[PDB]
Amino acid sequence: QAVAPVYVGGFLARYDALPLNINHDDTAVVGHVAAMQSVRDGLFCLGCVTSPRFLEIVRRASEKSELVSRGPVSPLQPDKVVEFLSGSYAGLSLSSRRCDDVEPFKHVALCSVGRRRGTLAVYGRDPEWVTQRFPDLTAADRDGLRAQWQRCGSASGDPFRSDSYGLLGNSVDALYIRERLPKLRYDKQLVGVTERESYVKA
Amino acid sequence: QAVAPVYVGGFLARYDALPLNINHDDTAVVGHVAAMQSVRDGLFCLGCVTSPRFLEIVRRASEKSELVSRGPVSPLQPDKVVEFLSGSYAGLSLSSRRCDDVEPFKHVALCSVGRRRGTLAVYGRDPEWVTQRFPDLTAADRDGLRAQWQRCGSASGDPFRSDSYGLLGNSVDALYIRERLPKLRYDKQLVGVTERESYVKA
């Protein structure tokens, strides 16, 4: 139930499939990207967090979070896991291939905050609901996207090979990313997603 | 070795024994307070983190921290665990007893940042070295303290009853404490402990 897929959506890049992993750690793959689309304002990505090992690390953690326990704003239903994710991995970043590396491209990572602005992550239990939170997303855009997510969603088994300690390790790094909240507040304002219509914790 | 005691020291309160636990969670007790002393400028506390379950959650986590991997400033030796602690639990707060609660007083907690200012935590592998980082601490103060720590240090077994997920849960709450770094930068400046003479990450 709470450990059910969580879709995440957002802009990977503004003009102003790929494994989904956590903070680029290639052993922390938590799902895949269901659809991608160059919308007029940027390149929108809708991903699917499907790793049960991950969702369980998260579910157990959310249960000890004060932030998560205060819940959403008003008529929205509490979703402990969807909210732990929203307050932990609040931004997206796309990684492409390089000639330098050991062996839209390499993968998509969930981060504390993205680097390019407007890369706010919006988690949800529904792909339409998620694409629906974005006012840049035209009905049309929502069509090309839905057409795709209808071919990618929830084999090699569980792709998650990190653990509880890995996540706890980078939660400390995030504490030392400067201008995190500020950048995140600029992002939700740029992209138009409010904590009144979604689970945005920033 | 890295999983050896870590002493923490600092002011619990300015004028301008007790179980040591993590963020007041009474199941996350990580050690005890070895000495306490009302120094002229406040009430100084030197604690001892002794829980092997805790030190192991921490050691494994520090190994995935970028902050921890950059190490200390200059001639100081890298201490992954001492640095994960310094960047995670950067402040102290004293909890006294209340008539309200279920059944200097109740306990001392390690927090992201303390509430009262000047409550910066300084971790170390040595009690003298730790008391020694504080320029308010007179040789005298250091005597009353040492006399005590020579009676408290490293039975009911391991007092730690939380887990990896608990810690990961509050690492997210810390991300939403406003003016954390600022308060921490004010604290190390108030108390006189520099990242040039200790492992302060703030």
From Swiss-Prot, chains A, B:
Effect of S171Y: 150-fold reduced catalytic efficiency
Record-given protein name: Assemblin
Active-site residues, Swiss-Prot/TrEMBL: H24, S93, H107
Consequence when changing H107E: 12-fold loss of protease catalytic activity
Residues of the site described as Cleavage: A155, S156
Source organism of the structure: Human cytomegalovirus (strain AD169) (HHV-5)
Function: Protease that plays an essential role in virion assembly within the nucleus. Catalyzes the cleavage of the assembly protein after formation of the spherical procapsid. By that cleavage, the capsid matures and gains its icosahedral shape. The cleavage sites seem to include -Ala-Ser-, -Ala-Ala-, as well as Ala-Thr bonds. Assemblin and cleavages products are evicted from the capsid before or during DNA packaging.
Subunit structure: Exists in a monomer-dimer equilibrium with the dimer being the active species.
Outcome of substituting L175R: 1800-fold reduced catalytic efficiency
Subcellular location(s) per record: Host nucleus
Effect of H107 to A/Q: 22-fold loss of protease catalytic activity
Catalytic activity: Cleaves -Ala-|-Ser- and -Ala-|-Ala- bonds in the scaffold protein
